[PDB]
Write a protein that binds this ligand. Structure first.
Ligand code: 7R4
Ligand code: ZN
Length: 258
């Protein structure tokens, strides 16, 4: 497959190789704050990242992934809408060419500068590959980024990007603490959806935090110096690596907060 974010291979083309692109539970979506319902049934959300073990950072030609050791329950997400234990496998971002675009989810049609996805898999399915084949296989914690003050807990990520400029490059990335990327409040919206890139599998419980984090203009500018291309290929800046909002269809978005 040769999917990407350009005119010729972007989101509007994905459905040809991945017909589930036009499915019933695709992500991202617009979160209409005046339609989303407070759900008193939601249990408290539990982000347990104390023992997280980051390993490596990889430019895969679509984004960069910070990868974690998920061979044990070291960094897990529980509670909220979730039954059981979901293990952190990786995080990555989607961002824009300009500060007015970049997020995948939107809030009352507002686009943020970027969006962080912390990807977790349900440990009752044993491995990530099995989990993506299940409707409750993954839990993705989504966090919006706006441009303002610098995020100190992001700077270690920003400073390694020079070493993974092009597709296929990776770097050792140990001892990174993903707690430094969270906002103060864990208030969230939740709905059932999908992976936001091919293969677009409808296996995700989305948990989208209400409170954005602030990052500096200089931090997001460094994301925009990454490349989609491989080393020694013509430069194509890694920007606007976001899928637009998809039809909500039969779904309800629930709020954790009044
Ligand atoms: O960019 C993304 N955001 C998501 S949420 S799923 C996709 C990454 C991904 C994760 C797992 C398998 C394939 C692709
Ligand atoms: Zn993502």
């Amino acid at each position: 497959h040769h999917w990407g974010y350009g005119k010729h291979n972007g989101p509007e083309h994905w459905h040809k190789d991945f017909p589930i692109a036009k499915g019933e539970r695709q992500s991202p979506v617009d979160i209409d704050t005046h339609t989303a319902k407070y759900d008193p049934s939601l249990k408290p959300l539990s982000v347990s990242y104390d023992q997280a073990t980051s390993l490596r950072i990889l430019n895969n030609g679509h984004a960069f992934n910070v990868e974690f050791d998920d061979s044990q329950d070291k960094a897990v997400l529980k509670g909220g809408p979730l039954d059981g234990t979901y293990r952190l496998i990786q995080f990555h971002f989607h961002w824009g060419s300009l500060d007015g675009q970049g997020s995948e989810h939107t809030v009352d049609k507002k686009k943020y500068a970027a969006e962080l996805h912390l990807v977790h898999w349900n440990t009752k399915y044993g491995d990530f590959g099995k989990a993506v084949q299940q409707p409750d296989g993954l839990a993705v914690l989504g966090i919006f980024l706006k441009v303002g003050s610098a995020k100190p807990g992001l700077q270690k990520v920003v400073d390694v990007l020079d070493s993974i400029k092009t597709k296929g490059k990776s770097a050792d990335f140990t001892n990174f603490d993903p707690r430094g990327l969270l906002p103060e409040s864990l208030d969230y919206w939740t709905y059932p959806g999908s992976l936001t890139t091919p293969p677009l599998l409808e296996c995700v419980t989305w948990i989208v935090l209400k409170e954005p984090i602030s990052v500096s203009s200089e931090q997001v500018l460094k994301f925009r110096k990454l490349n989609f291309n491989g080393e020694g290929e013509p430069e194509e800046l890694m920007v606007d690596n976001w899928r637009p909002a998809q039809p909500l269809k039969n779904r309800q978005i629930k709020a954790s907060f009044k």
